[PDB]
Amino acid sequence: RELHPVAPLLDNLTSALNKVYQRKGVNISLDISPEISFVGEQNDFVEVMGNVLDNACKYCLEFVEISARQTDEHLYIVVEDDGPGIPLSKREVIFDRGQRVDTLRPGQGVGLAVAREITEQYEGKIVAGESMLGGARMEVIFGRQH
């Protein structure tokens, strides 16, 4: 399947988000080596990452960090923020379908339930954890990279 360099896609997403949240002054740092790529449908990668990155910008206090690594069959994108995080007791239910009635602000994404379902199409998943900053750590994993 087609190969998509990750850095440029994340750059496109950040740029769009920097606008939506320009008033908040979120500082988004990226550590994505140039060779890291995503194998699959570009829009799938962007829908998942757009939802996770929008959440980080929305809930952070100021800092958001994005990093990535890849192995032979998997791609790992980690998004960390310095916000309140996701309570231990909620790191499960946030991936289930909820009452998302008209929450369609122009920057809203597909939601985490749908984002996880997309990663599962690639034999992947999304793991909710805690960052060093104490806020959320979301690790997005896509499989089927070989």
Ligand X SMILES: Nc1ncnc2c1ncn2[C@@H]1O[C@H](COP(=O)(O)OP(=O)(O)NP(=O)(O)O)[C@@H](O)[C@H]1O
Binding residues for ATP: 51-59, 81-86, 100-112
Q: Which stretch binds Mg ion (CB under 5 A): 69-77, 86-94, 108-116, 117-125?
A: 108-116
Query: x/- binding map, residues 69-108, to ligand X, per CB under 6 A?
Result: ------------x-xxxx-------x-----x--x----x
* Listed residue (16, 90, 2, 83) closest to 45, CA to CA: 2
65 contributes a contact to ligand X by CB under 6 A: no
Q: What is the largest CA-CA distance in the chain?
A: 41
Q: What is the torsional sign of CA 13, 19, 24, 26?
A: positive
Instruction: Give the footprint of Mg ion on residues 42-61 (CB under 5 A).
Output: 51
C-alpha 89/C-alpha 22 separation (Å) is 32
14 contributes a contact to ligand X by CB under 6 A: no
111 contributes a contact to ligand X by CB under 6 A: yes
Q: Which helix (H) or strand (E) holds 35?
A: none
CB 139 within 8 A of CB 75: no
Enumerate binding residues for ligand X (CB under 6 A): 51, 55-56, 58-59, 81, 83-86, 94, 100, 103, 108-109, 111-112, 135-136
